[PDB]
Ligand binder design. Structure first.
Ligand SMILES: O=C1c2ccccc2C2=C(c3nc4ccncc4[nH]3)CCCN12
Length: 207
């Protein structure tokens, strides 16, 4: 396990998301589903030039998996996945520029719900989660686990968990008062409101 320090801008955004009083927390799910949809569009588009890009799995889908025992909500997609370089370097660049633009927009009067317009919607996961684990597999790299409970650091390690084939899993270790996001009726409600036109099958798993 390697440990890395978040740069100042992203660290400030994470504290803002964790600390600001904002009741409309449900938007995290729309953001993660839009991210999944964008990752699936990416592998699908690449597959048009190279069909072998789907040798790692032909199915293009999004699964929403709640687990009341573990208090987790997992968003699984079979999209492009992320390499080690994406996790550590490339997305660090995006977190910095995206946070700076979002922070400026917020000062002007924009809402926390507009986060996805700044390419950092992934960080809305901290509205409901005390810890976020990202398990990912890109065709050109190994399976990795990125993890952060904020506090200024994140970790990256090669993942020894169940082999995924290709894609990303965002595991949300929910805050104690955010367990409504494990309830079937609640997830179904959010998906219908914000994600009804996503061009991939969204399967809401039950327990
Ligand atoms: O989906 C997104 C995403 C979307 C937008 C921005 C960053 C991320 C992002 C990650 C990330 N933020 C970082 C911050 C600093 N240095 C390395 C970093 N890597 C890793 C997990 C997935 N992720």
């Amino acid at each position: 396990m390697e440990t890395f320090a978040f740069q100042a801008e992203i660290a400030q955004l994470m504290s803002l998301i964790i600390n600001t009083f904002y009741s409309n927390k449900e938007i995290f799910l729309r953001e993660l589903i839009s991210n999944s949809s964008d990752a699936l569009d990416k592998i699908r588009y690449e597959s048009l030039t190279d069909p072998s890009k789907l040798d790692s799995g032909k199915e293009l889908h999004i699964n929403l998996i709640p687990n009341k025992q573990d208090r987790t909500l997992t968003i699984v997609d079979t999209g492009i996945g992320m390499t080690k370089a994406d996790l550590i370097n490339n997305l660090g660049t995006i977190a910095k520029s995206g946070t700076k633009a979002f922070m400026e927009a917020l000062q002007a009067g924009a809402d926390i719900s507009m986060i996805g317009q700044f390419g950092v919607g992934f960080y809305s996961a901290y509205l409901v989660a005390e810890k976020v684990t990202v398990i990912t597999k890109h065709n050109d790299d190994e399976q990795y686990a990125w993890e952060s409970s904020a506090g200024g650091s994140f970790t990256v390690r090669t993942d020894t968990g169940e082999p995924m084939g290709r894609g990303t899993k965002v595991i949300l270790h929910l805050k104690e008062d955010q367990t409504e996001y494990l309830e079937e009726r609640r997830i179904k409600e959010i998906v219908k409101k914000h994600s009804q036109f996503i061009g991939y099958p969204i399967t809401l798993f039950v327990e």
